[PDB]
Symmetry: C3
Subunit: 430 residues, 3 copies
Amino acid sequence: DQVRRCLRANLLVLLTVVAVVAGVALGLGVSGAGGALALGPERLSAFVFPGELLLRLLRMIILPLVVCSLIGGAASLDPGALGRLGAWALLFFLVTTLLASALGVGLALALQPGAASSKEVLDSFLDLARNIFPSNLVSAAFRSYSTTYEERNITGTRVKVPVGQEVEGMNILGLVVFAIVFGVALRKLGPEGELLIRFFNSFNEATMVLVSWIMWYAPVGIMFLVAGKIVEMEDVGLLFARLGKYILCCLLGHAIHGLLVLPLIYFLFTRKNPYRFLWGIVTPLATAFGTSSSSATLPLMMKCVEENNGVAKHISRFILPIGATVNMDGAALFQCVAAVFIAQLSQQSLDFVKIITILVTATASSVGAAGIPAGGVLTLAIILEAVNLPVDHISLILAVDWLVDRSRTVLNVEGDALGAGLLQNYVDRT
Amino acid sequence: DQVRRCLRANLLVLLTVVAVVAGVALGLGVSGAGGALALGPERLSAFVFPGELLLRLLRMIILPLVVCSLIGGAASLDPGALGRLGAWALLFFLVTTLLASALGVGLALALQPGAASSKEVLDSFLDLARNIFPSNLVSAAFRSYSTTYEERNITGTRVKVPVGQEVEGMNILGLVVFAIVFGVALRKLGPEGELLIRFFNSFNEATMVLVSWIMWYAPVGIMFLVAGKIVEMEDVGLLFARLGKYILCCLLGHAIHGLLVLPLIYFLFTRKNPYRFLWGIVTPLATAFGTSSSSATLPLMMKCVEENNGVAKHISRFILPIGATVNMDGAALFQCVAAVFIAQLSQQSLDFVKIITILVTATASSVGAAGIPAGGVLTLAIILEAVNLPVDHISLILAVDWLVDRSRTVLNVEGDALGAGLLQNYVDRT
Amino acid sequence: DQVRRCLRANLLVLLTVVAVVAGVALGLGVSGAGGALALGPERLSAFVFPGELLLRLLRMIILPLVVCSLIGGAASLDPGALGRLGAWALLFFLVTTLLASALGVGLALALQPGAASSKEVLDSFLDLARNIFPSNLVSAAFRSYSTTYEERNITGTRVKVPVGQEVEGMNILGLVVFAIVFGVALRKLGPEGELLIRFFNSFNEATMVLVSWIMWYAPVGIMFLVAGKIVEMEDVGLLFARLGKYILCCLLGHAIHGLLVLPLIYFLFTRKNPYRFLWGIVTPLATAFGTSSSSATLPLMMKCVEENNGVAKHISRFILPIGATVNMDGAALFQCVAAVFIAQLSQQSLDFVKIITILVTATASSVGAAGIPAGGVLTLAIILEAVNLPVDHISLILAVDWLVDRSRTVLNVEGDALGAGLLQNYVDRT
């Protein structure tokens, strides 16, 4: 009786969990021989080919997406005409998202999950500040700046001077900055520039449907990508231990954040115990753990914040609906652990500017992730292509995304709940 | 009395036939010395320079044209709300255009006209399936994917593994696929995405006027291109024999198609003799041979299909006006013989995926060719740039385009006439 | 009392003159040691880095600016429906701007200011005519055509044949030509193509505000650019002599033009003495020298042309407001002396086609310069990037721009004043 009411509703989720559980089985059926006994390199990158085609489609789409959604979502970003009473709420959201992402990078650099087994001088801050502001906007859709060294035989015979050249791989770091600045420009332009907001916001909605079609293709690509990814490692008992250490490190980041950082930020200004606040708001967190979505939590959260932890009733309907779309600390933890776990699963050595352009671009991507159908994974592929990491390891993270999701939902509501607790103590004392 | 009523009406056609007949004369006046006695290579590519400038202008225009006309013509492509009663007519049009193009490629590979006188493994189907879906959309306006080989000294000392890189020459194969998918996306988006259809369909009409100006320049370019093309061959009696074999092979393809393939497709389902149908519709084919245009045939064809070969009168006003713009089998023959005659006039060896991306891109270009002023030749330059063939041989084909046109018009009306004969036998039996 | 009425009004001009006068002081404070005693090349291009960031931002903006302002300003270019009675005025404006620019190039090639201290054959007119009409429009936003030579061992063993390749650096020469032709196309398209004029003219006004923000950043960049530019020369008493010879040559070009060329053009057709005309129009030129702006001159100029040098009263309100925005001979002198002074300040040897694409692109940029905030300097950076000159010397020209501006304003009003004197003698004789 439930063959056309349950399976038809979430057919894509059943299809991708069948494709993952038959992707590990196909990879084990190839690894029973191995990566070189069935067929060698002449057909190794022809068995894994739909798992390359999915990445071709995703890299095709993240060029219109991050430059047409940021223009339409920074031209519709209101200044303090929206209210300076909730601008401290936006500052709190940005600061706690940056602290969440920095805690994720720090914890998955300290615990080091996945690492079980060119020389560039420290002035590559210049190689990032030349990359924020690109030289032109058509040669910043496929290639970025990079400084290489040489010898000129001056002052003796050997000295290392840097020379600059634009090498391949697009810069999403310098194409979200132009998109943000152009969105602020179209907001400042007023009613003369509404045609551009309508054009760039009908172009973003004409790309989300392409994401819908690509995610409908994505079971086949994720099956062959998992199959090609657990064969190339030539080890199955080690990769599941690396995934277990990844889940342990990300759950530890969620627990450490939501039990010691946001309580400390609440205690530093309110100077009342935040655990009484959390004991008031158990049941919205208990249903956010339940349904694993921050949309069905918001009415019950906006209700239950009133009776126990009494607020002024005009900020809890103002910062809470913009606290479940803008403030997402759990997605910041997931992007900043699941993109320094891939950097220790392929040994890319994680230069000190890759930390900055994995931290600020996952702060600037947890505020607009939950509009995309597969939001948290395509917005991880964006920050993987922004630091030139291998995107092919996205399927070992999409395989264990449910264990992380069921405790990732609660941080996104805990953040703006403690923001509602914090912002009421800047108006009860003036 | 007819100096301002006849010459002013078709001045471009008189100008281009004067420029062709003075292009062969100028090429013969240079070949009286030859390609190296007047001036050598220091001024050989300075005498043929306007015939290079015309190709620069055409390659400039086929980037906005095939990506802004396909979006506007696939967003205005109606689904079966247009009618499933004539969706078998569209399937018939696509199948007979593919069969016409395959017959053209097969016949001009078998008879081999024009051939009178890098190693890549058979897995370059991967090099086309990586090219359908490009990696990004700004680096697919000038460069396409291509797999090259090397040696890695593994398993012995010598093995041939493929490595990938994006080499120059744009991919029109993977820029019509994104345009088609984006047009279907803008159709699905409904009334929120009408601004993009108006933008991309005012951008296509603001490029057709550039085609009008370039075709007004085109006499000078075609004169110097013919002059440079019959000098470089260093032979005049052989090139006219190759053009004669080209005209013979394309006329043989038209005759074989319109007398043995579409009759066979009609006989396989209706099982009545199609030559009685053609004996009913002699005179619309006889005036389509006359005026050499499928626009002045359509009222007389839509009339004469009724009285003799009686139809249900609601499909002959429905599939016939969409059978003279969409179904063009003669243009498919002309594109798929005149682009494997250039591949045997310059020895490009015609790899087995170039047959596929000369067959499906001339099936997908005979449905939108007759809106451009010089439609059948610019849409041949498109499929020449899609397979990296030399576009410079377009002027030996535009020189003999009248002998092919006067029997190319009749296939485009014979196709939908037999489609009207076929579709009436899927409703008289239900 | 004047701390919030004078300093708040022109804060950017005070900030940039403080940044220039503290840019020469910082450069002298580094040159007290020199370019290699404080820190060598490992930190020489890290002290001059904001003066590189300003050039990165300017090269980012001149790609949307010159292709979105020319479309919107050539689609709003009226044909002779504006009037053939003032089309000779537009021809006069174009001819005197070309003569002004040619006099500037000739005078700063003859006097040779700043010159105190690859082989390509003369057929690089082909390398410019292949660059006017680019091969495609996405690979003409960052790279242009360039012919290099080789040897093929034919006809002996050594001969020099040219081969072509697209090398880096965008072609603004071939991206204003497509923009002009597209603007004429959108004008011809009529009311079907008003959406594109509104899109490309709301995109140009959404880039002028980015020029406003970049010019607000520009004090820091111009301070560090002046500081890095007077250190690298390793000479301070010579660079100020080169700037003095630059000011002398440009003032000599202004004086020679406005006292011997436009008087000669007036005398060649009217055959009356133009110095009586100038003695009538002393005081509009005397206030144009005063306020240094051609906007506050136009009412007094349009008044004072009537009473003394009597005109037909319908051309002095028609060609004078389009003579203070379109005709700017002083800006043509400044662009065509200040871009062959940089070519003699860095020894780029000034090939005979760089004269043509520094002359016609500064004729085609003095007609739309006075809409940009820093118009005369960004429109100099455009023509410096169009000929691949070093843009880094823009700050030695922006430092002495006031001495040139106060006598550059008077040529832009003298031009259309003598045009009003000229055009009245093609209607008083018919």
